[PDB]
């Protein structure tokens, strides 16, 4: 019944590809509604996001809206929507399977150790950062504000070389630690509010999945950031990369880069041997 607009065109539930329910098979649980690995009847491998049957009426419309929103993107750095199963219960959104999993656990689980000497290098992190910036620029070019850019909301196509990172998810619960001053004080959101969050995600990537402001509470962060406090560089983080983070966290939004420039700056970093030859901490 409710419709939705993006890049000039309005659409509704009717435009979603409704796949029969008996053609969908679940398998293993992947994470928390919850997400399952699935199969659609060379059969097609999918992820299935479920809406719990025990839920309010508000929850279902939020769910419906998400299928519409994700179905409407066409970009290689945003997880594809395969289809939906809304007419049988529980309701399903079918999504591109991302064998690399969540970006945060990936960083946490593949951190170099004497076990995995160089299981990952500086250049691999920059490529992950560029990928998400590319998806964010597409969002920005289409006047869509994500509001929750974070490693926990990014996914990887595979574990090994050639992995591609894509955006995969859309009071006290607000992710304060990823929000610029104008977001949490005034509720003002812009493409520049996504820019701030991307800087934090950038800290997330180069810290290899450490929680931001590791010893601060949400309120301490709110007071810290307002007073002009910013995070220190991740361990061993190259200066050119840290410089992108600090520019993303400029206090006035008009002084933060748009995503075209951020993309431009990340690519420049990948052309700098002193950046890409820096060893990750073990
Ligand atoms: C949509 C999709 C998810 C996977 C996948 C593949 N391996 C995993 C492992 C955990 C996971 N956790 C869930 C809760 C999740 C994490 C991050 C995110 F951005 C979205 C998301 F649903 N998801 N996951 N492939 N495709």
From Swiss-Prot:
Tissues expressing this chain: Expressed in brain and CNS. Also expressed in the small intestine and testis, but not in normal lymphoid cells.
Resulting phenotype, residue 149 to T: In NBLST3; somatic mutation
Compartment(s): Cell membrane
Annotated effect of mutating residue 70 to N: In NBLST3; somatic mutation
UniProt domain Protein kinase: residue ranges: 24-275
Residues that hold ATP according to the record: 32, 49, 96-98, 169
Effect of residue 133 to T: In NBLST3; somatic mutation
Active site per the UniProt annotation: 148 (proton acceptor)
Function noted in UniProt: Neuronal receptor tyrosine kinase that is essentially and transiently expressed in specific regions of the central and peripheral nervous systems and plays an important role in the genesis and differentiation of the nervous system. Also acts as a key thinness protein involved in the resistance to weight gain: in hypothalamic neurons, controls energy expenditure acting as a negative regulator of white adipose tissue lipolysis and sympathetic tone to fine-tune energy homeostasis.
Protein name: ALK tyrosine kinase receptor
Domain of life: Eukaryota
Family to which the UniProt record says this protein belongs: Belongs to the protein kinase superfamily. Tyr protein kinase family. Insulin receptor subfamily.
Disease annotated for this entry: A chromosomal aberration involving ALK is found in a form of non-Hodgkin lymphoma. Translocation t(2;5)(p23;q35) with NPM1. The resulting chimeric NPM1-ALK protein homodimerize and the kinase becomes constitutively activated. The constitutively active fusion proteins are responsible for 5-10% of non-Hodgkin lymphomas. A chromosomal aberration involving ALK is associated with inflammatory myofibroblastic tumors (IMTs). Translocation t(2;11)(p23;p15) with CARS; translocation t(2;4)(p23;q21) with SEC31A.
Post-translational modification comment from the UniProt entry: Phosphorylated at tyrosine residues by autocatalysis, which activates kinase activity. In cells not stimulated by a ligand, receptor protein tyrosine phosphatase beta and zeta complex (PTPRB/PTPRZ1) dephosphorylates ALK at the sites in ALK that are undergoing autophosphorylation through autoactivation.
UniProt subunit comment: Homodimer; homodimerizes following heparin- and ligand-binding. Interacts with CBL, IRS1, PIK3R1 and PLCG1. Interacts with FRS2 and SHC1. Interacts with PTN and MDK.
List of residues that carry Phosphotyrosine: 4, 36
Domain writeup: The EGF-like region drives the cytokine specificity for ALKAL2. The heparin-binding region binds heparin glycosaminoglycan. Heparin-binding is required for ALKAL2-driven activation.
Gene name per UniProt: ALK
Outcome, altering residue 65 to R: In NBLST3; somatic mutation
């Amino acid at each position: 019944n409710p419709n939705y607009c993006f890049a000039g065109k309005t659409s509704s539930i009717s435009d979603l590809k409704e796949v029969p329910r008996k053609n969908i098979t679940l398998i293993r649980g992947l994470g928390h509604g919850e997400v399952y690995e699935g199969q659609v009847s060379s059969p097609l491998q999918v992820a299935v996001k479920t809406l719990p049957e025990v839920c309010s009426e508000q929850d279902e419309l939020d769910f419906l809206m998400e299928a519409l929103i994700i179905s409407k993107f066409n970009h290689q750095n945003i997880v594809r929507c395969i289809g939906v199963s809304l007419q049988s219960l529980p309701r399903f959104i079918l999504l591109e399977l991302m064998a690399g999993g969540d970006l945060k656990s990936f960083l946490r689980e593949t951190r170099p150790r004497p076990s995995q000497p160089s299981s990952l290098a500086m250049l691999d992190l920059l490529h992950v950062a560029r990928d998400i910036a590319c998806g964010c620029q597409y969002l920005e070019e289409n006047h869509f504000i994500h509001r929750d850019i974070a490693a926990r909301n990014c996914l990887l196509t595979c574990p090994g070389p050639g992995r591609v990172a894509k955006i995969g998810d859309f009071c006290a619960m607000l992710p304060v630690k990823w929000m610029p001053p104008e977001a949490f004080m005034e509720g003002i959101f812009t493409s520049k509010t996504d820019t701030w969050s991307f800087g934090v995600l950038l800290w997330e990537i180069f810290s290899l999945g450490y929680m931001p402001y590791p010893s601060k509470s949400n309120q301490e962060v709110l007071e810290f950031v307002t007073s002009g406090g910013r995070m220190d560089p991740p361990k061993n983080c190259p200066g050119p990369v840290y410089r992108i983070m600090t520019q993303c966290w400029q206090h006035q939004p008009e002084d933060r880069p748009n995503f075209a420039i951020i993309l431009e700056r990340i690519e420049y970093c990948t052309q700098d041997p002193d950046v890409i030859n820096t060893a990750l901490p073990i």
